[model samples]
Target chain A: THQPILEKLFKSQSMTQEESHQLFAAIVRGELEDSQLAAALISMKMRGERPEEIAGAASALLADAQPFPRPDYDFADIVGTGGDGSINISTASAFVAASCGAKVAKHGNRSQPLAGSCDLLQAFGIRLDMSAEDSRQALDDLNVCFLFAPQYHTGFRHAMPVRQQLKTRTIFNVLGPLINPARPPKALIGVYSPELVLPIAQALKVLGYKNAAVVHGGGMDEVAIHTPTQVAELNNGEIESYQLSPQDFGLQSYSLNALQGGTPEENRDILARLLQGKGDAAHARQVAANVALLLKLFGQDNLRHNAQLALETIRSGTAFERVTALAAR
Target chain B: THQPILEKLFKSQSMTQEESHQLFAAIVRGELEDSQLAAALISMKMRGERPEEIAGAASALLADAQPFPRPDYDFADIVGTGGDGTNSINISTASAFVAASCGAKVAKHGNRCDLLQAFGIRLDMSAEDSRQALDDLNVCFLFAPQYHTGFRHAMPVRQQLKTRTIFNVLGPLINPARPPKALIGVYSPELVLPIAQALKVLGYKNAAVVHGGGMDEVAIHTPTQVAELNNGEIESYQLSPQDFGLQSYSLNALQGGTPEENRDILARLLQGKGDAAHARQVAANVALLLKLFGQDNLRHNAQLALETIRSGTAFERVTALAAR
Candidate 1:
């Protein structure tokens, strides 16, 4: 259904992907009554969508999408299903690692939760608007590719104004990471809530991702984070689940208050200091732990050795220099 | 959770059956953090619960329920998950024959949908209280409010809340009879298809339900929309007025200016006004229900069975209710 039609039916609620796809296609084909379309979307959202239903919606979305040509490179795309209202630098540490040696094909949006993926990358002066050909070439030539979401997923642009007007997290917030246009073989997806960890991982597995990790960090200042962060790791078609704490990786456990970074610059400063090997033990350990996991994900040595490698990659300035050169590009 | 605790949590939003069970058990045992329990319940309802999750919840609900020693009978309950906000009379017309001679016991919830002083029947019992009455009266009258005390806790929230919440859909699924077999009528047809599917996952083996063509039987009405899930297979079907060899009747014939008017017509149909247009429609519904229970075939003459209503068997069945 059209945005106006959905607005009337939902009456200030957000339309889910399934609801949107069904209504949109019918409206485009002139098969659905406008009023019925609106009512259907609102009602369906009232009754939540199933995982299969969400996948079906995503399938329809991809069906209508103009495909991007990023082929022949297996990479892990790291992105957040952003609803964390805290605007901070994107998790671009994986991008640096990818440029240094790890293969990364990051698909991301602009300023959503805080400083979004593209926003942080923009801060570093990397071009975010390369065509599909250039994007594929970047992955093939530089071993690092960035797919600016708005450019590749045109359907999202039509839904953006409504999302902005709502100023709330709707199903669209979750669909972005799930609908990455390049359809990467592996991914590290961060969710805002623990319930989504398993569901999103299962969705990715269903969508044919070979290996995926859905994470919800505990230090995030939300009530949903009162417990240790949850993770659902899917590898080779089986899901392994466990909780993670800073202590698990030999990092000092820091309270949410201790890890607060108020703005994008502040968050970026903390992240950069950690990358520069100048942060507190907790900060450095968190980054090292995540990077170590990424390395192991890329089939590096064991996790501990991967952690050591990650430390050396940072110390030798390879990770920072990679971002610096990409910025200059 | 205890009643007070559940009430407090429901003020914010509904709770999944699992969340409710866990929180309830924790609260009863003094094991849960008050704030954490509160947050979990509120957030779950703010989002929505899935059908399987909801079914899991109903299982949990029945787990804690007080047992009712029902008579040795296999029956089907016909009810609605009604929150369409359009109140109508009890859908017991077609169900009478379906329960009496169709080899299935039937327990139905009878109530006035709207608040009108002129209505002869005043439904004062809550869903739980009604279940008690049904036990006492030998047939269940599941007052919606009692079976789902959670909804009453959520009443203020639901009334104040303009949008349809998860509870709107869940109420119908949580029948107090918790009948193993049922025919549930929904307010909308879109719900028909999914609800039939959900029933299978909810462990129901047979359920055939429909939504009337008009909102309140006030228009000539379109065909009645139906969803019949039998033995784990779901089928979507429709029944038009023409299906019964009858012409469409205007909503005026069935329109009751008030509940008393509606009740009078209902009683008259039971008293046998075979030629009345509304009576023919009700008879068609009964015949279809008989076919659903496998008591008769499509080609078998249903009019003879329909005439059994006038033979006093149907009315006698109600009057002889306690002896069933």
Candidate 2:
């Protein structure tokens, strides 16, 4: 029962996978006390929760979220769990990848303490609450579809109130990237903490995520423009870790804040002008590097020959044109 | 300001005395969120909290507690911070009665957990009852909850969390009756330093914070760690039953179970009729308290403690309290 699990945490001991599985099972079933739940989260963090504990918890919370058919399209999802204050980074990656002819099913939430991808997507005036069938249809029409996270992971709601009350990050923050409903054959996940990069990759490997990249971009969740990003990648059943920078894509680094911090409208406009090919390539180059990296992971030869193609995808209007026809679809 | 203090905890950093003082102030004012408060406590334990942090927090919590007018007798306290599940035998409660009967003015502060309540001790002493207990019997069980009611605000988190914490050891350091000396038995050995230091900072003329045989109090079964604070300087040392001419025994000899069993054993111990292991452990603690009050000689204090129990003066005090 959760009582012994809570006792183990209070005593400052780590829980086994079976123990966390039991507690998490009760949590998703709405059977544990908030006190017990909160204690479990706080305890794991004090000593740092084990990767298996995370694997066990993620296994259950995401269990009911039935995975969509492993779509055959080269389209890969680009998203991150946003509780770490990393906003707008993954939103740009979603559009850039779609613009470059990659099939996309990006999963995310709406406005939270920080801006969410759905809010940004809606700001671009593309409807976000699309159905699973609608999502496949959107990918066919626009080469991209946004999978609003809550549409599939109903159990996520049970953990949200606890997360919000703590006003601090929990394991759910790490579990988010693993919950993509479509289970896109490949994914590019940005994480808030560097400590999570490897754990996320290990969990995916354990859960049999075929190929994907879990990233921590300097201090941001998405690919960093100012510094290198740490990546823990899973490919062909083996996990590899490495670091990369904007220079890898022939892009110049900008001040971290130079591309960060603005109202939602300011960022929405940043998205618009870039796809519309008019102003501020600062955000463009960042999203391009992330998308290029994910596409490169999917298939190297044609998926991402260079960042120039990503720049062209935006400057040449192919990306903007897809959304301009959203109302027609 | 309190926000920065709380944030430092998430980053795995310790606070200065002033920051801890501020954190404690906000806690008393009920200005901090429970989430932030619980985080700070869990964080501190994962990486040990500094002595200054403990002192600063204890300073604020005990600041508002009104003190008893420092009586001129060999008056002091005997207590332990109770959260470590050290519920074995209500030995401190028993030793206090014995010490008080041995001609010490004892202002013993405590809470009514299972063991103490099982031994039939009251934790709701009004100030008048406290004073009358002292004035008449030379002993007063100053119920901690009645003295430091502000602790209720922190209880919602502390009780649910159920681990040993800074609040556990803070009890003996913050007695409102303001005894000039204390004999505090803590569950953790590392706590001896900080707890003894907190007593010195809070104006204890003499005090000892001890961990005996890994239990929270002195034991006749094995060695005990004692950190002694006298006037100002502190001394750290260990003592065994052999040090007081007593023989070591198996720790199981002190097993505690029923309230009825405990009450019977307790009444008999006070009346000088308990087993050798139980009586020696109780006598050692009472003697340690006697020496902390400057009785100076260990053997002499041990004799005094045994005589008080042997003569039935200790038993008479318990009887008188029941009559009252």
Candidate 3:
């Protein structure tokens, strides 16, 4: 049954959206073998994944997700399709944005051998083992919540082992931001490749998101201080593309190593310092620049003003208060 | 590790001969996971296999095989790279018998097909018994699985893969007897030159690798493309049925049924009481096999092959081999 699907892919033919959905649905249902699952994933990637294929897989995971009820206020998700550096920029950006009065529902998971958002957050004493109700309670308590991907998209349990064994990232890496259980109306999504910026924005249009800013910069999945960041903004029904520079966020340039991080505890210490307005200046500006983009996505018209506001939020210790509030609970 | 090998293959990079040999050696050694093995095989095929890769894998399998000692006479093999998906008559097997009747020594290597079973020959004979049959009857059969015991390690994965890999085409190249001469048929014309090139690397004395239009025999209806290895050099050419002094007939003329039905038709053909088209099909292939054995007059070879069947000596060879 999977042979025809695999044969079509091997011949470099694209699968229909529904066919891809059914194939993934079978995988999530644990109806296939591990070898075949690996072959399917590798073959899908070997011949580049089509937009429809990405959308279809997103549909399967979204349809099977444990939904977070839409909150009363407009909240946004700030996350990345993560395969960049050790710096946990998006996690830091989420807290800064939330401290600046923007509700944030961040979606993430424990990446293979990488310090993930959950790893960093758990080190900060934020309870990631909470149930859906407790996660929602945290959102109301601190204006920010973390929807750990495995907890919300439990069906992926079947493929987690297979994905871990593969040497390269598969389509699942691209699916994280698209499958946010919060179903947030607006998002600042960073992808690992510049080539993926527009397609992901287009897929967001298909998935019916209200607005999103899909970004990539200097090979990092977040806004970069070292180089210009590629951005595809999906606003209303249309998508526009452009790039942003370090000066756009009122910041000076720095090397990628300046933003590098260590273990979860190390990153958490650096984050703790940045939130208290006392860490490395390059790291502080990197976090604020990502937060500035989220602020811009949530209706701040002037990126320069948003960057100043974000940096001040970090400097005034408001962002540190948001994280400490979550940890205290 | 195989992950590196597989990652290279996934990137469409070709492996060197030694790399290919080591990869297959690992597979035979049971050192890799089944999933990685499947991935490696599929990746090898998805990106077309290179000649060095083929040569390397063949060397690994050959090195692992139980030896079948060489005989004094210049024995030749007649086999095919059989993924034809057709029920055509066993032309190469029949031609091996016809060639042997005309005084050519054939050590035919084939797999477990009902064609041999229909002739009342058991396939489980030891290498010693098979060599004895060759000495007494001028022909013998090499059942593939018996001598290449190491292939069992990869067979289950190959079967579950349900798609062709380098292993599918490896059968004809790794004949345990390592005969000097051979007439091999492949199902695809693209494989004609590569297979012959592999034979050259293996130091074959003489061999003809042919793809008949689409089938793997010396095609009767369509012109067969050939990559011929002569001594140390190789040539590319085409052969028509007319080249063997036989008229062309549609493949429908050679259509065969179940193994039992084909056996009856083969018996009648060898007894000189079968259809003319079927007899010519057997003779056409025999002409090529005999030509590889140094009987070079193409037309004369076909007449002698047909005469060998007409005089019932071909079936006599089959009967004599069956007795042992």
Candidate 4:
């Protein structure tokens, strides 16, 4: 029972991988009442959670995951350490990477503490509620597909009320990258905090991803040309931290305010304009930097070369054209 | 605000006197939401409250206290750090008047209707009448509600909770008139040390906090656990009645009764004539109070406690108090 799990957390201890999995699975299955759930979240929140704890929760979240149709091929997913409670940077990067020769599976939710991917996807008019086979068809033809989180992880519904009532961050928030139902072999996870980048990236390695980049930029959990970016990459069989600067690509530094997430109207306009090949330098450059990171993970070794590919995709209008067709669908 | 107070505690930080005072005042004033209050109480229980925090809460509880009718007298009190939420014999109640008849200023603070009604201590008396009682007979009963009105706001939350909380342990520490020295009987042995430190933090002249033998009473039948605060230092030790030249009996001998049952017990006890078990328990508690009041010699101190009862002077004083 969670009483034993909660007792360990109360004493400032972490759960074993299997134990954490059971705890999360129980919460997801609605076996815990609010008092038990609130206590569980509070104790873990007070004493920081370990990576194994994070991975354990993710594994339970994936317990009911439906496999994607194209299990035969490698796929890349752009996800925020959403547990940011919100996202926009990687929402924009999905199509950018897809256009730059990286097939991307975008999985996410409407989170906070800003605008989530679903909020932006709605703005782009791409229908994310497709069947698994439909999603695969999109990935094959359009090179990109959006996997709405709730559509795949059926058990999360039980915890929605508790997580919402808590009004604080939780394991489910950060589990975004790990529960991407498709099991994308290459994942570009935008972490919400600098400290989380290394650990989540290392956890991705432990989860046995082939190549993944857990990146945090300007504290937004996405690549920020606006500030120095920290990346924890699990490449081949190893994990390591890598630093990147706007100067590396001769991209001038800009303030994150220029990438401001305003209201739905403003964010909708920003997405529409960016996909139209008419987005400004700051927004376009931010998208390019993240796209380059994933492209690098995809075997495009040179940073500047990936940046060149991204700029071309935007100017050639393919990034916009691809988003337009998906929007139309 | 309790919100800010909770954030710090959730991070495992200790609160200062003023902070704790503010937090408690808001709770007693009904200014805090139940969620915040419950969260605060639950967190403190899980982490254990700090001594300074306990003292600070007591200070806030005493903020609106009515001054004692006899501040000029050498006042002392014996109180159970109540909220044991059980009915034990009123050792402190009877001993309050016994100490009074023994020529000590006894200002017993109480809210439990059982004790007030049993003693027939009029709750409606004005300050002038109370002053007369304290002066003429050396004993005055203080209704907790009559003095610390802040407690009414705490009624609901405290009533709703089933387990022991920090507020329960604060009773003996938050006396209305701020007695200079106190003999506090705690419900939990683990609390003896902290309660003593809390009293020291609140600047008690001489205080003894004790717990043992299944009672928030003197704990005479067993080796009572004690923490003494004196002249700015704390000392903890254990003592059996054997150590003080008294026989240790089985705890069953000290079991209490109904208010009416106890009223008879108290009458018999003060007259130095009751169930031997009950009288010995009361005398042992009073002796501890006298010790806390700074009677340097333990043997002399305990002897006077029995003498007051055996001489009939203790009951004689009760007659005068009843007649007045």
Candidate 5:
């Protein structure tokens, strides 16, 4: 039924979401014209793929994925659908802290964005072992584990050749955060566009995610800490949007220049110092604010007191020790 | 200046029409990215292509085409951009005779739509032979392939393309004859409005085209859509089944049952057979042509056209063609 439609869409014409879903499902079911599939991808990107179209493609991708067994724990993932063309290591350290305390099973790829989460974590000696049993065990034992995407969703490898040939971001970029193999109960996904924040959050809810937060830092630079960050939080079937300024956590707003370190190692050192409560006022306060947010995710309302607890968790070396143990395992 | 823009546009992110125009002008200057030019072509179709975009693209196409000397002629071409998926041919054949006899040069292209063959009526025929054919026959078939070599190179690409595209509209707009006036029919109502607007923008002094309700036939099964761009003013009007004093007919009446059936019907109508479906279709279209070219008032012209068809001037013109 859908083979002819996919043939027409990818080979001869551009398709909308409804068109792509019908075609993508056919492709997943192995009912497509094989030669036409690459042409369809190329044609859609050249024509400028729409958001709903990407969502539809993602739905098709997830439909073919091997589901992970995780009914016991409700988890939230913090990942970026990153094609921002920036290489940094801050998100990796933050995820380690958040997962250590808040029990996040972070799902990410090697480097969709430059020096992506897994890339930085691997740089810091974190082992990215493959196997669903190992991943589930690690999550249960360590309170944190990385699901390196290509190992889990192997179907993406089949499509990656065509995606690479086009040399442009397609719907596949956004599909990463949407198609978490664990089927996490919640997600904290950051997208480049502010408009995507609410829409992606809504889509997560539609896809049966119980709670999610889609965010974007307003600053254009990768390492800039001076700018405000906006977030759309979806919890228990309801959504709320808000912005957090640099001043929100008692840190004086500095120019992005102040936050620009020389290299990833330099940036990682700054992040480690901030986490250990031995960095500059801005750095310590920002890390504290992020940890406070994670505490809020655990239903703690007294943000300042949560910040103090977060400071202690770092000062007492508990957070650092967790990373060391997680890395060793 | 425009070269860099085309390089960026064809090789980069989505661009606005103004950006397309800057690149399009560069393409006209022959400064296009070889690998990315086709991507630009596909991009325009993906985006809801606007009339201004069509006009801009066509303008660039014309600016780059090999210029032929325009002969002193007061002619009008009646062509449709034709991708309504409607398989009809040679409306321009009958309409051309009527317009030329009523004082307009009828420059048109004719090929066998049924066989999908090019007979080379214009190519083999010498300039003297063509002049004699037009003067004696009151119409000249330019036969597109001979007139536009660049388009001939694109024929394979166009043939393999299964969907409607910008190239579909471009062919009719780039009439090799460069006729001073035209009454171009369009397949869709959306195109009817924009194309008529485009004709005015392209500096046509007198042009009026009708998109028939059933598309293949001029019978008014639905309201016949019209756009008239004349004397620098544009007016859009719709003509219902009753407007032409004709009853509504099924799309079946207009369908060419087979190639043999269509040719037989065409021959019968050309020999002045009254009450034939093909004859009635041609007469209804002639009525519009008569009024559009100011040969007679709209209502009276329709009545006069039936008599003219009956009197056999239109039929004789068709029959007096040079022996194949």
Candidate 6:
């Protein structure tokens, strides 16, 4: 029963892979009670989630996720754990990166703190709850499909209400950026805390990511335009840590206020103008900086060169073209 | 707001006295949401509840409780945290009778009222009935659910939580009578001092918080840890069966069965016909309460406890309490 698992978590005993897998498997199956799920989630959060628990739960989610298998296009994902309430850069970054000739499949949910990527995409007129056939076609045709998280990770319906009532980030939040249904070969993942950088990187390594970069910058969950963003890079079965600054991307530094976001309508206007090269240059640069990081993860050139490429893509209106086409699909 | 308090607790920042008091006050008032209360209770459990949190919450509970004030009669309490599923004798309840028989007014407050009911003692009595029982018999059983009606709102929350929270420790502390003296037992040894400190801060005249052999009460199986709160000063000590001139008995030998079996064993022991080991274990606990009641010698008190049992005075006390 869930009691033993809940007890193990409550006692500060890290769950075994089998235990985590079974616990989450039951959760995904909607076989566990709501209070048990709430207790388990809070217990793990208070004890600090362990790496195996993350990997195991993510594996369980991925195993149950409606797969958006794209064998021909090796896609990359740009997503964040989204507690920083920062502007929706990763959504725009996916477009810019795809416009720079990379396969990008962004997976996201509705906002907990700020405008969620799905909300931003929805404001741009993209169909979020697409069929598996339609989502697969979007990625095939545009090289930039938005897999709305709830549409793909359907099992979270059982847990979402509890998570909503909890009003705090649990391991499920961390599991989001880790379990993109498109199964991206490369990723530029952002987290809300610097402490999670290495642990999530280690979990990704366990999940066998070909290449991944987990970033947290200036307290926001993206490549920073304010301060040096902490980066944990996992490649070829090993992990390394470093700091990436706006300077690294050949961009000028900006304050957090420069990136403050609003409702989906406001952010959608910001995204449209920025992608069309007519909005805040600071916001456009932040998107370009994250695009540069995603490109680097997807086997591209240096950060400055990739940042230049991404900026050119956004300025040339091709980034707008990709998102507009995605909206039409 | 409870959200800020919950966030602080979730962040591992211990709540201040005001925060703790206000949070519990909202809970007892049924003003807090069920989910938020669950979250706060679970958060406190995960963070290792602090002494200030316990004391503050207890203060709030006591403030809202229906007072069973017996100004003329000084009383003592025997209670345990009750998580230790030892299947052993109800040591504290049994010891309460012995202490009452030895001239101490005992208000044995416990959640498990069926045990007393088995002995024909009615704990479902009203506050005045309990007061009269204490008056006429020098001992009364304060059924936890009946007296602390302030806990009415939190009852369903605690029941649904199915996990132990600070309330378990706070239970033994918030007797409605505000008993000045107490023999409180906790399941974990680490809780002894914090509980003792909480009692001291709560203005107890004297109290002994104890744990032994993985059980909440003084044990014959292992050395019992004791944190004594006396007249505002606290001291920590340990006692074993030998300390009370008794031999150690295997826990299996003291193994009690269902409530009926336990009631029978308790009935036999009080009537001076049960196993010597069970009687000795009860005597050891009684001696501890006697010492807490200002008896100078543990061994002499324990001997007196045995004599009270053999002479059927403890049995008479139970019958008298039941008759009331």
Instruction: Tell me the whole-model lDDT of each prediction, alpha carbons only.
Output: 0.56, 0.74, 0.83, 0.75, 0.59, 0.83
**Candidate 5 lDDT:** 0.59
* Residue range B90-112, candidate 2, lDDT tens digits: 68877988888877888887765
Better of 3 and 6 by TM-score: 6
**Which one is best on TM-score?**
6
Task: Compose the digit string of candidate 4's lDDT tens values, residues A1-329.
Answer: 56677667756688998999999889878887555565666667666778998888888878877677756677888877654432266867888888877899888865642467786776667886878898788888888888887788777787776666545565666786788887778988887778888768767776768999888877777777878888888988788887889877657788877877678778878776776778877887888888888887888888887877787777666777888877765
Looking at model 4, residue A11 earns an lDDT score of 64
Candidate 1's error at A110, in angstroms?
2.9
TM-score of chain A of 6: 0.96
lDDT of 6 by residue, B9-76 (tens): 77878998778999998888888656677778887888898888888999888888776766455778
Query: Which stretches of candidate 6 lie above 4 Å from their native place?
Result: A112-114, B29-35, B150-163
Q: Give the TM-score between model 6's chain B and the true chain B.
A: 0.95
lDDT of 4 by residue, B2-53 (tens): 5677677767678888889988888877776554564566567667888999
Ranking by TM-score: 6, 3, 2, 4, 5, 1
Model 5, span B261-319: residue lDDT tens:
55665555555673455555665676676555566555565566556656667655554
Better of 4 and 6 by lDDT: 6
Write out the backbone clash pairs for model 3: none
Q: How do the candidates rank by lDDT, highest first?
A: 6, 3, 4, 2, 5, 1
Higher-lDDT candidate of 2 and 6: 6
In candidate 6, the residue pairs with backbone N, CA or C atoms under 3 Å apart (3 or more residues apart, or in different chains) clash, namely none
Q: What C-alpha lDDT, on a 0 to 100 scale, does residue B50 get in candidate 3?
A: 83
* Cα distance off (Å), candidate 4, residue B284: 5.0
Give each model a TM-score.
0.49, 0.91, 0.94, 0.75, 0.75, 0.95
